[PDB]
């Protein structure tokens, strides 16, 4: 399938799941697709209120307030060689690309890999300070 794909990027998959995300975050993530050594897609951009309610009920979020509800966050999924992986180092590499793209765009993007506790690689968001809601 991918033997002749000299540089693997999941552009189309990502752009589809970026629909409805804040345009400034979209711009950063699109640039990060160019820079990342690790292919990735956006597995979740906009999240419904019902999904967030389900997460609160189940205990995977404390609050119904989520940056995903308003367009201010994405969860990425690492796709090395077209295969999903959850291994940390892939997400650290994606975050290098996001950090570069963000800097170039003059936008701070917070990464879940730098949460104070329970670090998790997929999550990126625009800050509440810069992008209130
Ligand atoms: Cl930086
Ligand atoms: Zn997230």
Q: Which residues pair with 77 in a beta bridge?
A: 41
How many domains in the chain?
A: 1
**What approach was used to elucidate this structure?**
X-ray
Q: Which whole-number Å values give the CA distances from 42 to 3, 23, 57, 63, 130, in the listed order?
A: 23, 14, 24, 23, 22
Domain boundaries, position 5: 1-133
Going edge to edge, which strands form the sheet with 123-126?
Answer: 40-44, 73-78, 123-126, 109-111
What is the number of H-type helices and E-type strands within the chain? Answer: 5, 4
CA of 45 to the centre of ligand 1 (A): 23
CA of 121 to the centre of ligand 2 (A): 9
CA of 131 to the centre of ligand 1 (A): 18
Question: CA-CA distance, 39 to 93, in Å (whole number)?
Answer: 10
CA of 103 to the centre of ligand 1 (A): 6
Helix (H) or strand (E) holding 133: none
CA of 3 to the centre of ligand 2 (A): 32
Resolution in angstrom units:
1.3
């Amino acid at each position: 399938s991918l033997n002749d794909i000299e540089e693997i990027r999941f552009t189309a998959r990502s752009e589809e799941n970026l629909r409805g995300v804040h345009p400034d975050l979209v711009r950063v993530i699109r640039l990060a697709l160019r820079y990342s050594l690790v292919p990735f897609s956006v597995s979740e951009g906009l999240r419904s209120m019902a999904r967030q309610r389900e997460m609160v009920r189940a205990g995977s979020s404390q609050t119904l307030r989520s940056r995903h509800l308003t367009g201010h966050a994405v969860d990425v999924v690492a796709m090395p060689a077209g295969v999903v992986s959850w291994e940390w180092d892939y997400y650290a590499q994606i975050a290098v690309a996001v950090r570069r793209a963000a800097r170039e765009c003059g936008i701070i993007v917070e990464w879940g890999g730098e949460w104070k506790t329970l670090k998790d690689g997929p999550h990126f968001q625009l800050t509440f300070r810069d992008y209130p809601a």
